[PDB]
Amino acid sequence: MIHELLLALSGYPGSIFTWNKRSGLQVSQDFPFLHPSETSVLNRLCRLGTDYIRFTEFIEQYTGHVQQQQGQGGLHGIYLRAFCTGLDSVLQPYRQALLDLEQEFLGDPHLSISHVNYFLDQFQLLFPSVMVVVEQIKSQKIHGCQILETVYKHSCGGLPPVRSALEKILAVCHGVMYKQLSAWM
């Protein structure tokens, strides 16, 4: 129960936790030996994995996928590519945490899912927050420097961790404009 949860969240979909485009990852939920206790916790855990699949998929889709054949500002463009480059670096300690967790499970073979769900509670708020930024960029077809304000307007929140997280992606997106400005000026 423990270790394909790491398998599912890592981005290789499980035959128990069924990946759908309309239900994300989802437990089979028809076992004659499931209990109401585990249901809520699996539901809490699968949200982060759904968001992670969307994030990694989008980043792989729109960063370095062409040899340049104008493009689209929200589906191509160097600001958008740099946004994805910042985004995967922000996602790194989650991957590190899963790698730590497997060693914990190996050391103690009797362990339950609530222990895991307790540890992963700090991504539980960070991952849904950042989704709406890339959602707005993708839907609203934002082109050029107006991308730079969008994460900037969303770094005004009252959550310090999410604010500090988005600031790095904005800092990555500054450098490309800096690099071109060094030549034009």
């Binding site: 004659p32 209990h35 109401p36 005004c156 929140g157």
Partner: protein, 329 residues
């Protein structure tokens, strides 16, 4: 057979999955209490009136209730009626004659309702106000550390027996502060304009600290600092940048009040306006070293030098630069 057999043997599956208990009983009244109660009922000639419960041991209930207190929802124990947890009476342990057990689980459910409503509010911001958002994060910050302790305790069950009296008396210094939290949240859910909806809560926070002025007052203070973070930032912005940023006028004064910074507030407004009229011609990181070197009374009177020095500098510089090259005198 071969996995179902292993299930039946080496996993429990006997109340949370409907398969009546085969837990080994070594009877004799301390745990044969249901049967002696039935014989006593028969001697009182009921006649027959048979009750149906699923027969669990005690410890499973303890782990489920600790799960309920941690903040997760939808468990087999405690039927849920309209949103409120309520004790189920279709669950029996042999002794405690089914009436004590009802009372103990009802008390734990009485605490669980208080935990559930707060976590419901926290879940409802995950699916510009910015002060509610700073409030729920501090609530969450309490909750994660609170969950840590109970999650530790539940591990030690697997590795020793633990009873109800242990778990209720262990959580006394937390259920103490939970009652404070029930009172603070009552006025944070009592509400049109976003500025009164925040100031009404924040002023209650400013007032309530004096009521407990050990361990509770530090909780109130640490809750206090992480919730006045937006207003502090906006005031500092109005100081150093000259302009007051408008969020449908989140500040109390129009370009409803709080006591917090009222007795110096005139010096603050006279600071903000003066800075933008000067250009026409770190505060938190100072407040935190003050904690290194009464609570929100005399300590709060040390906050005002930080803003007052800056005020003095701004107004004196403007007055100085107006007296030359336009030379009012």
């Amino acid at each position: 057979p071969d996995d179902r057999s292993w299930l039946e043997h080496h996993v429990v599956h006997q109340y949370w999955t409907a398969r009546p208990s085969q837990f080994p009983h070594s009877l004799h009244l301390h745990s044969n209490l249901a049967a002696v109660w039935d014989q006593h009922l028969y001697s009182s000639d009921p006649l027959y009136v048979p009750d149906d419960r699923v027969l669990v041991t005690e410890t499973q209930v303890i782990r489920e209730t600790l799960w309920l207190l941690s903040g997760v929802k939808k468990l087999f124990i405690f039927q849920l009626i309209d949103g409120k947890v309520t004790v189920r009476n279709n669950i029996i342990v042999t002794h405690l004659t089914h009436s004590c057990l009802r009372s103990v689980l009802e008390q734990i459910a009485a605490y669980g309702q208080v935990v559930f409503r707060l976590q419901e509010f926290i879940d409802e911001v995950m699916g510009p106000f910015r002060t509610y958002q700073a409030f729920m994060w501090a609530l969450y910050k309490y909750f994660i550390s609170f969950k840590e302790e109970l999650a530790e305790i539940e591990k030690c069950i697997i590795n020793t027996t633990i009873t109800l009296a242990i778990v209720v008396d262990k959580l006394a210094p937390r259920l103490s502060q939970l009652k404070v939290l029930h009172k603070v949240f009552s006025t944070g859910v009592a509400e049109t304009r976003n500025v009164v909806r925040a100031s009404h809560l924040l002023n209650t926070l400013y007032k309530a600290i004096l009521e407990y002025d050990e361990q509770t007052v530090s909780l109130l203070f640490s809750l206090w600092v992480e919730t006045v973070r937006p207003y502090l930032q906006t005031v500092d912005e109005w100081i150093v940048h000259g302009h007051l940023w408008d969020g449908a006028r989140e500040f109390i004064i129009q370009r409803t009040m709080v006591s917090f910074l009222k007795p110096v507030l005139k010096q603050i407004i006279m600071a903000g306006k003066s800075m933008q009229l000067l250009k026409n011609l770190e505060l938190d990181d100072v407040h935190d070293p003050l904690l290194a070197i009464t609570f929100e009374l005399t300590l709060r009177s040390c906050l005002y030098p930080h803003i007052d020095k800056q005020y003095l500098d701004c107004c004196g510089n403007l007055m100085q630069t107006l007296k030359k090259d336009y030379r009012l005198v």
